[PDB]
Amino acid sequence: HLEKLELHQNALTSFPQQLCETLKSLTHLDLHSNKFTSFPSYLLKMSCIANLDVSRNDIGPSVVLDPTVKCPTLKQFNLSYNQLSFVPENLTDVVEKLEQLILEGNKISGICSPLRLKELKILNLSK
């Protein structure tokens, strides 16, 4: 019954899986300014999460999410500032109710995908 959890500005790497399966009610989770090296991609396998925030870590290129998962409850996916050379190669199939896709400050350089999301409101691709 935690309903929010802030682990930002630590030296955390690789947030564990059984803690996600335990945390069945985090409607908000921010873990930025950490030394994350890749997106765990099971953090979307929680029950009811919005405002997932991984925004100052160093998530390497090819941040593609696992296609065999569904998180139809996100509202913010702040993957800002890390290292992303491309957009997350599966967005239209895992985060289908996303609103604030924030990809600013990354090293995105290529011509982007069709980006077939259906409810974006604040798209950010600066820097």
Side-chain angles (χ1 to χ4, degrees), residues 55-61 63-70:
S55 67
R56 306 285 172 89
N57 304 354
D58 316 320
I59 310 289
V63 68
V64 56
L65 313 176
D66 47 329
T68 71
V69 79
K70 300 292 304 301

Side-chain angles (χ1 to χ4, degrees), residues 60-61 63-74 76-88 90-106 108-110 112-115 117 119-127:
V63 68
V64 56
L65 313 176
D66 47 329
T68 71
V69 79
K70 300 292 304 301
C71 201
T73 180
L74 280 194
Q76 297 177 40
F77 185 56
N78 188 18
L79 213 47
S80 173
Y81 283 154
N82 318 297
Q83 282 309 312
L84 311 183
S85 159
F86 322 103
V87 296
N90 285 316
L91 286 164
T92 80
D93 303 333
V94 290
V95 293
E96 311 149 325
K97 313 303 153 193
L98 194 48
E99 297 193 11
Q100 321 189 3
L101 177 67
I102 306 172
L103 309 179
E104 58 185 351
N106 266 298
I108 310 167
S109 299
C112 318
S113 64
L115 197 70
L117 263 178
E119 272 191 7
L120 288 178
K121 286 185 170 186
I122 316 292
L123 180 52
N124 196 356
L125 301 175
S126 72
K127 315 187 176 163

Side-chain angles (χ1 to χ4, degrees), residues 47-61:
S47 88
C48 42
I49 181 168
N51 209 336
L52 171 67
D53 182 34
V54 188
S55 67
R56 306 285 172 89
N57 304 354
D58 316 320
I59 310 289

